[PDB]
Amino acid sequence: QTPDKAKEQHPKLETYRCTKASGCKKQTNYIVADAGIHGIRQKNGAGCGDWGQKPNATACPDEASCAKNCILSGMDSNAYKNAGITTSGNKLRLQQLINNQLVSPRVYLLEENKKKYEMLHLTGTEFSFDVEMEKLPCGMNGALYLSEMPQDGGKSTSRNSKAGAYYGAGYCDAQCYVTPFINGVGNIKGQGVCCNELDIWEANSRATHIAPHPCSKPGLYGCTGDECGSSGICDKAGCGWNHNRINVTDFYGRGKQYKVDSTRKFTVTSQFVANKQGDLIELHRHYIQDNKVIESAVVNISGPPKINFINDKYCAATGANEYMRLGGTKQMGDAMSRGMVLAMSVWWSEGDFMAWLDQGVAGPCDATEGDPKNIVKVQPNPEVTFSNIRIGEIGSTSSV
Numbered sequence: 001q002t003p004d005k006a007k008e009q010h011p012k013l014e015t016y017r018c019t020k021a022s023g024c025k026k027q028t029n030y031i032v033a034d035a036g037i038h039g040i041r042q043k044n045g046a047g048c049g050d051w052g053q054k055p056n057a058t059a060c061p062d063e064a065s066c067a068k069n070c071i072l073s074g075m076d077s078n079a080y081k082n083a084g085i086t087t088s089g090n091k092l093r094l095q096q097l098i099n100n101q102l103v104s105p106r107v108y109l110l111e112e113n114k115k116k117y118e119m120l121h122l123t124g125t126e127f128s129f130d131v132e133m134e135k136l137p138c139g140m141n142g143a144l145y146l147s148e149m150p151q152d153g154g155k156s157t158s159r160n161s162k163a164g165a166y167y168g169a170g171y172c173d174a175q176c177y178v179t180p181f182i183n184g185v186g187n188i189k190g191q192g193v194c195c196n197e198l199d200i201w202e203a204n205s206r207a208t209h210i211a212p213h214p215c216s217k218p219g220l221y222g223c224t225g226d227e228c229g230s231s232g233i234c235d236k237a238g239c240g241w242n243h244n245r246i247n248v249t250d251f252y253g254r255g256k257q258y259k260v261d262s263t264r265k266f267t268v269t270s271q272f273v274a275n276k277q278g279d280l281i282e283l284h285r286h287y288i289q290d291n292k293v294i295e296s297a298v299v300n301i302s303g304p305p306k307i308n309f310i311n312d313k314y315c316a317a318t319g320a321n322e323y324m325r326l327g328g329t330k331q332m333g334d335a336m337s338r339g340m341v342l343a344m345s346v347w348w349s350e351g352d353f354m355a356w357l358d359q360g361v362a363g364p365c366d367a368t369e370g371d372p373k374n375i376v377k378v379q380p381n382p383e384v385t386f387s388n389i390r391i392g393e394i395g396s397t398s399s400v
């Protein structure tokens with residue numbers, strides 16, 4: 001679509017770049033809401049397409065018509081507030097509902113000029129953030145992750161692509177979903193929209209999950225037919241790490257009986273270790289709460305190697321078969337070396353209630369308390385605050 005003339009007022013977010021030798025340096029970034037959250041409408045008020053579908057055929061017979069008929073609305077700071085997004089200093093507060101309207105925001109980190117996504121090169125580096133998870137009950141997902149979105153939102157692929165990163169265009173992830181727009185142009189062919197994806201943090205106050213999802217195609221690729229499915233170009237399931245799945249059920253959860261208490265703030269430090277040739281070989285994680293380092297626990301089931309980090313051997317042993325077929329940890333590492341976009345979001349799920357994250361082997365939630373209708377009876381205004389985002393050398397983004 002074509003942006004109107006309203007003024008975009010991106011919330012500011014301060015973030016940090018650190019090195020062992022000179023500490024962490026503060027800088028200015030901006031947050032942009034997904035293109036779809038801005039509101040894409042025809043002149044008469046009708047929409048241009050819903051998630052899961054090709055864009056409205058009357059409005060979008062071809063790419064050029066779609067660009068002219070579908071209008072994206074700029075978002076001023078009140079529009080950002082009303083979409084559940086506010087910031088303050090180094091803190092990003094995302095709210096699931098505003099005046100009982102589901103806003104479920106998803107946002108990306110922009111460079112200081114606001115014209116390009118801030119491209120993070122994570123292989124061989126460290127990534128830390130503080131988080132506040134207390135208002136996320138079962139069924140909620142407060143996510144911090146990376147996708148290999150085009151840095152300019154897809155503007156360079158076509159003369160009809162106008163939004164760019166400035167208005168939040170170009171989203172993709174490893175599920176290869178069909179969205180009405182792809183790279184800022186109408187998805188006339190209905191391709192699924194795929195790209196490598198690194199889920200650093202997928203969580204609620206009851207359970208947390210980590211999962212790299214490699215794709216065999218680099219950058220944003222529109223799939224067709226079987227390319228979009230489970231035997232296609234991207235690993236839908238990923239190679240997961242959730243302490244509850246490896247039988248360490250007192251590691252993370254609500255209260256002082258857990259190693260990491262989700263009702264209070266804590267720091268998440270992730271280190272992407274590379275070998276001598278520069279390939280990614282392992283993903284490590286540790287936590288800081290009350291000034292103590294809390295190391296991840298070693299696998300506590302029979303089968304996988306007795307370690308506390310992700311590697312190819314841990315993935316093969318715990319059944320991540322598409323991950324291994326698509327290249328495993330090296331493949332994810334390549335995407336992460338080309339550079340990826342940081343995405344933050346909050347959501348729930350009517351279809352499965354986030355079962356994979358916090359039910360059965362994955363956590364302590366029963367089978368219905370994660371239903372959107374029951375979540376509000378536990379927490380009327382589910383939300384998450386991410387803050388103090390620090391990117392740098394291994395050993396430099398956090399400390400005790």
Ligand SMILES: *[C@@H]1O[C@H](CO)[C@@H](O)[C@H](O)[C@H]1NC(C)=O
Pocket residue numbers: 042044046047048049056057058059
């Ligand atoms: C498709 O666009 C046409 C033209 O504006 C509009 O009349 C119709 O309401 C739209 N259909 C949907 C489902 O939005």
Ligand SMILES: *[C@@H]1O[C@H](CO)[C@@H](O)[C@H](O)[C@H]1NC(C)=O
Pocket residue numbers: 247300301302
């Ligand atoms: C889970 O943990 C207990 C020890 O806490 C261990 O004895 C048990 O066998 C483990 N279960 C599996 C299936 O590994």
